[PDB]
Amino acid sequence: FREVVETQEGKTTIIEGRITATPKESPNPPNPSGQCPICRWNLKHKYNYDDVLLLSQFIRPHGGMLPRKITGLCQEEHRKIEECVKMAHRAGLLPNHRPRLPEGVVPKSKPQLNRYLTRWAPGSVKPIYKKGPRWNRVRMPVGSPLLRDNVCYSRTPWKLYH
């Protein structure tokens, strides 16, 4: 990877970029024919929002997603990981990938509510004041529809609406 250091010396600014150590993909992938990192390791349909060891490889230091052109993921898998990372952040599973705060900014304390499988952003969702009849019930989405094809080990399929 490449870093950038800004140094002001003698009322002069010097901008430089250095090449740091870069991690290498593990040798001998089980599926060399695979066209993306996911299917090269037979991981398609076999990871979830809580698989931070997997998810953390495709995100920036502050929690942002990495471009698909760089990682090499396909559109389908790239979108699945994108949602999985959002759910991982919201669940509190990435405590070392927090947003960058400018100097002098200490966030005010906010109520702690443990949550998981959170599709939407908490602030953007309204209360379900009128539930509607049983035949037209307003449902609370849980999880993501992008993961509907994940391997199901139970006879009941994933319920995405509660």
Binding site: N28, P29, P30, N31, W41, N42, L43, K46, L54
Partner: peptide, 8 residues
Amino acid sequence: SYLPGYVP
């Protein structure tokens, strides 16, 4: 050290 069907 990874078989053809190995999954992490």
